[PDB]
Amino acid sequence: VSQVRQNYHSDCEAAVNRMLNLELYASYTYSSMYAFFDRDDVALHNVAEFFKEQSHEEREHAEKFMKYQNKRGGRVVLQDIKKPERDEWGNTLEAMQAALQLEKTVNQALLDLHKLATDKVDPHLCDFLESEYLEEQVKDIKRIGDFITNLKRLGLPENGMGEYLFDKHSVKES
Amino acid sequence: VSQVRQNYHSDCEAAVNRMLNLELYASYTYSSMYAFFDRDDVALHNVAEFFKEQSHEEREHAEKFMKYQNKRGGRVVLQDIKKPERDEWGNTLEAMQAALQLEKTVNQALLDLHKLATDKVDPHLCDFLESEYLEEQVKDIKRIGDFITNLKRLGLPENGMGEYLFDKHSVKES
Amino acid sequence: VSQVRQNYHSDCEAAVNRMLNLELYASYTYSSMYAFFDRDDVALHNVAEFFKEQSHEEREHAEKFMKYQNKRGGRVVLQDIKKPERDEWGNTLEAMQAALQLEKTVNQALLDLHKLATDKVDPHLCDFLESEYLEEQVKDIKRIGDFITNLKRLGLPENGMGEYLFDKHSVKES
Amino acid sequence: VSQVRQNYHSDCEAAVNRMLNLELYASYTYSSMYAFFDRDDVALHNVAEFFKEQSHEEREHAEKFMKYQNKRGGRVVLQDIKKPERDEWGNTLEAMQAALQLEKTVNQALLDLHKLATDKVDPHLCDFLESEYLEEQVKDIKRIGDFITNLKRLGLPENGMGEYLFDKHSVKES
Ligand SMILES: [Cl-]
Ligand SMILES: [Cl-]
Ligand SMILES: [Cl-]
Ligand SMILES: [Cl-]
Ligand SMILES: [Cl-]
Ligand SMILES: [Cl-]
Ligand SMILES: [Cl-]
Ligand SMILES: [Cl-]
Ligand SMILES: [Cl-]
Ligand SMILES: [Cl-]
Ligand SMILES: [Cl-]
Ligand SMILES: [Cl-]
Ligand SMILES: [Cl-]
Ligand SMILES: [Cl-]
Ligand SMILES: [Cl-]
Ligand SMILES: [Cl-]
Ligand SMILES: [Cl-]
Ligand SMILES: [Cl-]
Ligand SMILES: [Cl-]
Ligand SMILES: [Cl-]
Ligand SMILES: [Cl-]
Ligand SMILES: [Cl-]
Ligand SMILES: [Cl-]
Ligand SMILES: [Cl-]
Ligand SMILES: [Cl-]
Ligand SMILES: [Cl-]
Ligand SMILES: [Cl-]
Ligand SMILES: [Cl-]
Ligand SMILES: [Cl-]
Ligand SMILES: [Cl-]
Ligand SMILES: [Cl-]
Numbered sequence: 278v279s280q281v282r283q284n285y286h287s288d289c290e291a292a293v294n295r296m297l298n299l300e301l302y303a304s305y306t307y308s309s310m311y312a313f314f315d316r317d318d319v320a321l322h323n324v325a326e327f328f329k330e331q332s333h334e335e336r337e338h339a340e341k342f343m344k345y346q347n348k349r350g351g352r353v354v355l356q357d358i359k360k361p362e363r364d365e366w367g368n369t370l371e372a373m374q375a376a377l378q379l380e381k382t383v384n385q386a387l388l389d390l391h392k393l394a395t396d397k398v399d400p401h402l403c404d405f406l407e408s409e410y411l412e413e414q415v416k417d418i419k420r421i422g423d424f425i426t427n428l429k430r431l432g433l434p435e436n437g438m439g440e441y442l443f444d445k446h447s448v449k450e451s
Numbered sequence: 452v453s454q455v456r457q458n459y460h461s462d463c464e465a466a467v468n469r470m471l472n473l474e475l476y477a478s479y480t481y482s483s484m485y486a487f488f489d490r491d492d493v494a495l496h497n498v499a500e501f502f503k504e505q506s507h508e509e510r511e512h513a514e515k516f517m518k519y520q521n522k523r524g525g526r527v528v529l530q531d532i533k534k535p536e537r538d539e540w541g542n543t544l545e546a547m548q549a550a551l552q553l554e555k556t557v558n559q560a561l562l563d564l565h566k567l568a569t570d571k572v573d574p575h576l577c578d579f580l581e582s583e584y585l586e587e588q589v590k591d592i593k594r595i596g597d598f599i600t601n602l603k604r605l606g607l608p609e610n611g612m613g614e615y616l617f618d619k620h621s622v623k624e625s
Numbered sequence: 626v627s628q629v630r631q632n633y634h635s636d637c638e639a640a641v642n643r644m645l646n647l648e649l650y651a652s653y654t655y656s657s658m659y660a661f662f663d664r665d666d667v668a669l670h671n672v673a674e675f676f677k678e679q680s681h682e683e684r685e686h687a688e689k690f691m692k693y694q695n696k697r698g699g700r701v702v703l704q705d706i707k708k709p710e711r712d713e714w715g716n717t718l719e720a721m722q723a724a725l726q727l728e729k730t731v732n733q734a735l736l737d738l739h740k741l742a743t744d745k746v747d748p749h750l751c752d753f754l755e756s757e758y759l760e761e762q763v764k765d766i767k768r769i770g771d772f773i774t775n776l777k778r779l780g781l782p783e784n785g786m787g788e789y790l791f792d793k794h795s796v797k798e799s
Numbered sequence: 800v801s802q803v804r805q806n807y808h809s810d811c812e813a814a815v816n817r818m819l820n821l822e823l824y825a826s827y828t829y830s831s832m833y834a835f836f837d838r839d840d841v842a843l844h845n846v847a848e849f850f851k852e853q854s855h856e857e858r859e860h861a862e863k864f865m866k867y868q869n870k871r872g873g874r875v876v877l878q879d880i881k882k883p884e885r886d887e888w889g890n891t892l893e894a895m896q897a898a899l900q901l902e903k904t905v906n907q908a909l910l911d912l913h914k915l916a917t918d919k920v921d922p923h924l925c926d927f928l929e930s931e932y933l934e935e936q937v938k939d940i941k942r943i944g945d946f947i948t949n950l951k952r953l954g955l956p957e958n959g960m961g962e963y964l965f966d967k968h969s970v971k972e973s
């Protein structure tokens with residue numbers, strides 16, 4: 278009943294709201310990782326800044342869904358942002374493994390939303406996901422996988438020198 | 452079993468490897484056309500350079516598939532690059548006609564890969580083909596068709612002055 | 626019977642075509658190494674880019690032989706480009722050892738071509754090889770040998786930290 | 800008996816003087832072609848300027864041999880510069896065919912001088928010919944052959960429009 282609404286199924290509107298929540302959840306998990314690596318007894322600053330930036334990017338993903346919802350005439354409905362699964366993240370390897378799984382969880386939700394949009398014959402929503410979300414996921418999943426391979430090569434979790442070197446050379450100097 | 456792999460069917464992985472080979476094959480055919488037009492008894496330099504650039508572009512298409520394969524967690528598998536169908540290319544008209552058919556053959560393979568990706572519900576691969584390959588083919592097919600029309604207008608194959616003028620005015624001065 | 630042909634033996638013409646094929650073969654082998662180091666379970670980006678550049682350089686070597694053939698009035702004859710000997714390259718040390726042997730194989734073929742050119746009293750072809758090919762081989766063979774020495778010093782194949790450091794410090798940052 | 804002379808055979812000294820004369824002869828022939836195409840009843844200005852530049856380049860080739868002779872401690876001995884074989888050059892095709900044969904005659908003399916230098920074990924003279932003369936000949940022979948192919952394609956000698964177009968598009972605008 279929005280004056281702009283056209284070819285936008287209620288199911289897709291609802292699924293966009295759920296996806297928005299998941300983006301915010303992902304942002305919050307990354308924020309927790311930032312704070313962990315900033316601890317004085319962890320002290321891997323470039324890794325911390327990597328996760329801070331990851332958090333900001335997820336927040337941007339969320340805001341883009343809010344804007345999308347309104348563009349199509351749907352209505353943003355917010356729910357609680359659940360706290361992350363862990364309060365402490367072990368080390369760079371454990372955190373990167375959790376990040377990989379988080380990005381794959383987000384990717385699966387996006388793929389599921391694409392299936393729904395396809396089922397409801399919504400090519401605009403399909404294009405939006407393909408053009409703004411799906412390649413970002415593939416690229417970041419590859420980046421994080423590459424990191425994990427290098428962390429293993431560097432002898433994580435046991436090799437502290439390896440972990441130190443990863444922070445200096447693999448992630449952006451901040 | 453790659454840690455990055457998600458929603459990537461074995462059939463699509465294999466078809467990407469076959470497509471990679473076809474891009475390399477197309478590159479090699481264009482390289483042969485370059486060398487032919489550079490012969491002292493052919494001596495159409497702008498036409499030669501046109502095909503040299505076509506060859507480099509196909510090589511870039513191939514490299515982009517290699518990168519894609521790895522991004523999705525598939526594994527690049529290479530096969531022999533078959534030599535071109537001809538050792539000599541007749542004249543500018545015959546070569547352009549062969550180029551048109553080559554670009555249409557490549558296009559059909561890309562369309563077939565899109566059908567497979569659609570069947571396997573792989574929207575990332577669909578988007579990749581649509582965003583990076585399919586429009587390039589339509590544009591180049593149109594360009595080459597336009598050239599063939601002009602070569603016929605110029606009296607090819609019999610009209611040597613027509614062929615000379617095409618090289619001076621239709622293809623980029625190199 | 627080309628109008629430009631002068632002092633160019635049929636044997637040399639044929640050997641130039643065979644050398645052209647070998648340059649293309651070398652290019653393809655280096656392309657395979659690039660793709661291997663770009664895998665998410667290998668993930669040595671600077672090493673990957675090193676081999677990508679090696680591949681492009683071999684392609685340039687091939688194109689220079691095509692141009693040479695035509696300049697002398699010979700005729701380019703292409704054959705299949707055989708796929709590389711391996712589908713996977715083990716690690717940076719194994720790949721560099723294979724690269725060393727590849728560059729020495731190419732060098733031996735160039736030296737053999739120089740012997741033929743000398744036998745047929747073709748000083749232009751001798752000069753072409755000496756001025757455009759032979760020093761490139763000596764320089765690259767030295768570079769790759771130096772790399773292998775450093776990879777051994779760094780404890781390859783067992784020392785993953787050593788391999789990580791080589792990628793950061795020995796090859797160009799890409 | 801020159802104080803600088805070392806490893807310079809009398810035969811090579813004499814052959815350098817004969818080569819010098821041939822370069823001057825080639826210059827003079829090209830000058831005649833320039834004057835012919837500048838005639839009001841020929842009037843192909845870009846072709847005329849092409850041959851004028853060819854003439855100046857041969858003069859530079861001659862001067863470089865004079866300098867070489869003195870560098871090695873030989874003595875420049877000059878002979879008459881014979882007038883060209885023709886007083887009129889027919890048309891662009893006939894002139895280009897004569898230019899091709901002239902450049903091949905010069906090339907054969909250079910190759911013969913290289914054989915002599917090789918026989919007398921004079922690597923400096925071999926290098927001088929290879930580095931300063933032999934590639935220039937191959938390149939110019941290819942250029943002129945390419946021109947002849949295009950003149951034939953353009954319908955020379957009968958097709959006056961073809962000849963006009965060659966002057967506008969194949970040779971440098973002067
Ligand atoms: Cl609606
Ligand atoms: Cl509709
Ligand atoms: Cl609805
Ligand atoms: Cl909702
Ligand atoms: Cl709950
Ligand atoms: Cl977790
Ligand atoms: Cl915890
Ligand atoms: Cl997760
Ligand atoms: Cl957007
Ligand atoms: Cl995207
Ligand atoms: Cl990327
Ligand atoms: Cl990495
Ligand atoms: Cl370790
Ligand atoms: Cl890294
Ligand atoms: Cl999968
Ligand atoms: Cl899925
Ligand atoms: Cl599968
Ligand atoms: Cl395969
Ligand atoms: Cl086969
Ligand atoms: Cl064909
Ligand atoms: Cl053929
Ligand atoms: Cl085809
Ligand atoms: Cl891309
Ligand atoms: Cl495209
Ligand atoms: Cl267009
Ligand atoms: Cl056109
Ligand atoms: Cl016609
Ligand atoms: Cl015109
Ligand atoms: Cl056109
Ligand atoms: Cl010959
Ligand atoms: Cl000879």
Ligand SMILES: [Cl-]
Nearest residue numbers: 633634635636
């Ligand atoms: Cl022969």
Ligand SMILES: [Cl-]
Nearest residue numbers: 638639642702
């Ligand atoms: Cl051959």
Ligand SMILES: [Cl-]
Nearest residue numbers: 531704705707
């Ligand atoms: Cl075979």
Ligand SMILES: [Cl-]
Nearest residue numbers: 709710711723
């Ligand atoms: Cl091997």
Ligand SMILES: [Cl-]
Nearest residue numbers: 710711712713
């Ligand atoms: Cl293998």
Ligand SMILES: [Cl-]
Nearest residue numbers: 726727728730
């Ligand atoms: Cl080898």
Ligand SMILES: [Cl-]
Nearest residue numbers: 689693753757
């Ligand atoms: Cl060169």
Ligand SMILES: [Cl-]
Nearest residue numbers: 757758760761
């Ligand atoms: Cl070199």
Ligand SMILES: [Cl-]
Nearest residue numbers: 763764765767
């Ligand atoms: Cl050096």
Ligand SMILES: [Cl-]
Nearest residue numbers: 771772775795
């Ligand atoms: Cl080194």
Ligand SMILES: [Cl-]
Nearest residue numbers: 779780781784
């Ligand atoms: Cl070690």
Ligand SMILES: [Cl-]
Nearest residue numbers: 445446793794
């Ligand atoms: Cl450093």
Ligand SMILES: [Cl-]
Nearest residue numbers: 772775794795
């Ligand atoms: Cl080093």
Ligand SMILES: [Cl-]
Nearest residue numbers: 804805806807
């Ligand atoms: Cl002496």
Ligand SMILES: [Cl-]
Nearest residue numbers: 805806807920
């Ligand atoms: Cl001596």
Ligand SMILES: [Cl-]
Nearest residue numbers: 807808809810
């Ligand atoms: Cl003597």
